[PDB]
Design a protein around this ligand. Sequence first.
Ligand SMILES: Nc1ncnc2c1ncn2[C@@H]1O[C@H](COP(=O)(O)OP(=O)(O)O)[C@@H](O)[C@H]1O
Ligand SMILES: Nc1ncnc2c1ncn2[C@@H]1O[C@H](COP(=O)(O)OP(=O)(O)O)[C@@H](O)[C@H]1O
Ligand SMILES: [Mg+2]
Ligand SMILES: [Mg+2]
Lengths: 638, 305
Amino acid sequence: AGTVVLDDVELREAQRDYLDFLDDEEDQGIYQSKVRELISDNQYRLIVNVNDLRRKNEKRANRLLNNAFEELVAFQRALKDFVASIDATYAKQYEEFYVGLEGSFGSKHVSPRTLTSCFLSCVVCVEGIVTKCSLVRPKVVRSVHYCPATKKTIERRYSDLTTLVAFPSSSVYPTKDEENNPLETEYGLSVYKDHQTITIQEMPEKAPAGQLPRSVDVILDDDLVDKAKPGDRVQVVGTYRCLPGKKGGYTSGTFRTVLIACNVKQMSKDAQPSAEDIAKIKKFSKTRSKDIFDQLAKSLAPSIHGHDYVKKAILCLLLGGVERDLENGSHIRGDINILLIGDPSVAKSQLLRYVLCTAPRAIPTTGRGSSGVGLTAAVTTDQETGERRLEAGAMVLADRGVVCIDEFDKMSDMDRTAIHEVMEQGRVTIAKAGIHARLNARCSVLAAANPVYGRYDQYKTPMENIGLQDSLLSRFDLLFIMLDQMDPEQDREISDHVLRMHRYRAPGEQDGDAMPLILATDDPNFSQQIYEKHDNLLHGMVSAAFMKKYIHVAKIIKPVLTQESATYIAEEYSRLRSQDSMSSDTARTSPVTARTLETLIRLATAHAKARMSKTVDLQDAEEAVELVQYAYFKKVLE
Amino acid sequence: FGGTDMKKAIACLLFGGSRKRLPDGLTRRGDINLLMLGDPGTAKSQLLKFVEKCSPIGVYTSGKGSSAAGLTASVMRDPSSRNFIMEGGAMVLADGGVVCIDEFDKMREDDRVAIHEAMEQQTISIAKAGITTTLNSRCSVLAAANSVFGRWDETKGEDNIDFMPTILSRFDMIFIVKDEHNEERDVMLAKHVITLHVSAEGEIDLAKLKKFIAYCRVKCGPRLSAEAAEKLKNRYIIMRSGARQHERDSDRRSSIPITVRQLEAIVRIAEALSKMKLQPFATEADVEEALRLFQVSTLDAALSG
Ligand SMILES: Nc1ncnc2c1ncn2[C@@H]1O[C@H](COP(=O)(O)OP(=O)(O)O)[C@@H](O)[C@H]1O
Ligand SMILES: Nc1ncnc2c1ncn2[C@@H]1O[C@H](COP(=O)(O)OP(=O)(O)O)[C@@H](O)[C@H]1O
Ligand SMILES: [Mg+2]
Ligand SMILES: [Mg+2]
């Protein structure tokens, strides 16, 4: 035995305050509910809002954010005590419970460039891009040993001294008994925790342009190991500390600083979505089940006038079809590909940026800005282990998402051919001699192309105006020729819409000032009404947030084609293939193959999902047929 | 000497319009784009140099980047450290500023892509094997160039320019500078140049002018009054109708279109004019001046043919 602590005033005060903060029955109950939730979900980490902690107790907030280690120890002791009070049987399962933080950190929210010595031992929140992600190695915290000679069993305990002074006696792994009998380690009884080290780099867009990047090393212990991968944008909250060196009679002042992450959260807070909202969505779907699709289409891109069919197709894309995984492993894609081939200044790029802002997992690619390995998967060598590793590309990242390819026409034929597999079956098959991989990228492609000669010459056929081959065009299920029509009436409409949008001003927030050109305030990307208010300057309209939530809920639904819609679609496809479907002076904008029948089925399923139909009915089939009829033909003038 | 309309356009470019983001999330750039096609004798390079020197944040480069400094931004992962080094070109170095791109007609294809996608959306989108970023390039592009034949011959109107409609749409204003026939202008120019050289008041010094520009940009963001917007709508409708009529009469698609980008360019010029005075709203006088400048730009869209 050694110098134990009898009573500690500061520790007792801290634990009492944290237990009080966690016990919420006289208060709203947020954290009691959260602890119950983690008990139900079988976890051992609680995310506590620093804002709530500061609200209920300013002193505890300052102490936790300025001296994190012992404060977090006290908080975790209080957490374990509270979990035992709620249910001791579960509290006994896990040795310890952990306290991750979230919310807003005033001056402790820094970038790897701004994470300086001043924040040592404090809690900091760093948002950055992952560059390196080591392997998840087990680290032994309690080793069980058996002596065959004496039949004894022993347990050796190793303290987590990652940042504390460590002496060899602590880390001596036992191999011999007291009388030099051999000891066999029992792996099935020892205790190991997953450990990983990653590197967080200053975001390229937020970093100063001139200078080189700055990065910080992050240690992730159990429950936080495989939360991030290289290239991801993440927020890591944890204690910035100093790592001890190794025993030596001489030392330079230099110390190796790291960040012991207490929680890690994805930048894609938009990648994920109350009973009030659920009931609101139910009533919205039920009330007007026929014109809901049209209302959503019109409200999709409010800032862009016209383009009704283009917006309908974009909505069908955002909804996606229903994949068919057959009994033999065969795959029929459900994503929907749209190619906006258009004259200059027709809002195709703006539609691309709208889908970027709205859809979850939307990746912006440009014609020559993403070539080959940058656009699809890649194979490299570790350069340290001499072993081959995969590297996800734009479309692999965009898996279960959308890729917005601006200036698609001006991509090299090499890249356009490479994208064929992603478009059709949604995967990248890449192999070097060492390693072969079949990565999944079930992304939907939204391409913005301009025609040869710059402006679409309406006298020439669409085949000539589109500088793309039929094999490539067949990849795009919907192909929209967006001309800059010279009608004075439509010009009046467009000009009025544009000038109204340019005149609009923010409500109250702005009164004549200039938009500003970030660490001061919480980062929006990581931050925690059915219709819009009918402003006359914006309308002369479903809400953005409600549209997001409704599209999220309607994406999951999986309508099934009904025999009547199947017959209708089959007959329409036969006609579309037939020559009579196109009159004289009308030219096909894309050859009609079985890919177009798949387009019809996917569009009808997307419409049924927009309606939450649960069955793709003749209404949906007719809408898909009409959209395909509009998209796949063009009338050439003489 | 001279070039008063170009100088007014340069002032409007320096002060910029108003950057806007609508509730849906989209953005409308408030930075004007100016192109100066003209004979090599004129002082286009000198104007670009002065604009770079006077802008708060301004970089003067060429179409093929600069010596040891590119034009746009690239990102490369260092295999050893695995960090993504971001090599910043002129566009990303002059974020929230001005890029004076001399010899605009001599760019590479990658530079052409980047400028296409950065002159309107103000961003450069890059996707290497590791990351998929979207850099921010808020920059007014002041481009210079020369006729495809070196000098502008009216006999080949609409053929003295090799630029595409897609890139001329990105431009808010385009000027054509000729030097053909004026003995009086030549003697005046010689007098003025010899003066300048021997000499080497209503003129704001460079420092105060730069500070003034920065102050206006940071403080004031104007908008359009309803009457000014209606006047602009009418003028834009008539201008587009006239462009349609001229194109149909010539039976050739003019290689300098008039589009919603031109409407927004007039809007931005009016906003810049109001911002000069710090009027939170733009008036009919400002929209009329913006329309006059866009007409001086249009003296090649229709008159050239
Ligand atoms: N139908 C339209 N509705 C609203 N704005 C439009 C429309 N057509 C053109 N514009 C305006 O013209 C500009 C064109 O820019 P952009 O869409 O990036 O290029 P492109 O239209 O060639 O894709 C946009 O800023 C947009 O506001
Ligand atoms: N209008 C002018 N007034 C005074 N000096 C001029 C004028 N035009 C040209 N110069 C002189 O002639 C030189 C040539 O012009 P330059 O800057 O090379 O333009 P560019 O090469 O882009 O046509 C300038 O450096 C300037 O000193
Ligand atoms: Mg564009
Ligand atoms: Mg020059």
